[PDB]
Amino acid sequence: IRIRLKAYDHRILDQSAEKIVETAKRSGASVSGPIPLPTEKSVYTILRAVHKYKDSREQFEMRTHKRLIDIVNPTPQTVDALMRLDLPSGVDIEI
C-alpha cells in the first residue's frame, strides 16, 4: 500500500494527498504522512527565432513532483474508502 502520487501542480497534488490522508486517518490505519519525494524536472531550451539567431533563445520547464503515502495497518474499511475516492486526472495515483 505504497501510494506514489505524481503531478505537475503542487496544489492539486496536495488536495489528492490529504484526501487519502484524511480518509485513511479517520478509520485507524496509522497513516504515515505524505512523504515528499524528489521532483524529476526537465528543461527544454529552444531557439526562439524562426530562422536565424542562435543567441536568442527561450527556456521551458517541466516539473513533475511526487509524494509517497504509506498505510501500514490493514483496516480494509480504509481500502473500501480508497476505492471510491474520485480525485482528478492531474495526480496519477499508483498504489
Partner: protein, 125 residues
C-alpha cells in the same frame, strides 16, 4: 554535545563539539588526513582561535557535498554555530570577525548565448 550546522557552497557539515582537547574528526578521518594545504586547517580553526576555545573541545564533523575548501567553509561555519551554542556570550566577537554570515556566493547559473554565465564568445566587426 553542542551542535552546529555549517553550509558553504553546496556543502553541509554537521559539527558536534564534545568536551575534549582539540581533535577534529571528519568522517572518521582527521584533519590533514582529509584536508591538506594547512591554510585551510588554520582557517578552519579560526572560530576556535578567535574566542578562547583552544583546548577545551574536540570537534566531530559529518560533512557532505562540495569540494574541500567548500567543506572547509562548512566546517568552520558549523564550528562557529556550535561554539555559539557553547556560550552565547561572544557573539559580538564572532560577528565582528564575520563567522555568522554563510557567504551566499553560490556558483552562478549559465545563460544562453554566453559560455560561462558572464563570458561573451568573441566580438568581431
Amino acid at each position: 554535545q553542542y551542535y552546529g550546522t555549517g553550509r558553504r557552497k553546496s556543502s553541509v557539515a554537521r559539527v558536534r563539539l564534545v568536551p575534549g582537547e582539540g581533535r577534529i574528526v571528519v568522517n572518521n578521518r582527521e584533519i590533514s588526513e582529509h584536508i591538506p594545504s594547512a591554510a585551510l586547517i588554520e582557517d578552519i580553526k579560526q572560530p576556535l582561535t578567535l574566542t578562547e576555545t583552544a583546548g577545551t573541545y574536540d570537534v566531530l564533523v559529518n560533512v557532505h557535498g562540495g569540494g574541500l575548501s567548500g567543506q572547509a567553509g562548512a566546517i568552520r561555519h558549523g564550528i562557529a554555530r556550535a561554539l555559539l551554542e557553547a556560550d552565547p556570550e561572544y557573539r559580538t566577537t564572532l560577528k565582528r570577525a564575520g563567522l555568522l554570515t554563510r557567504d551566499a556566493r553560490m556558483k552562478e547559473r549559465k545563460k544562453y548565448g554566453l559560455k560561462g554565465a558572464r563570458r561573451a564568445p568573441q566580438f568581431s566587426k
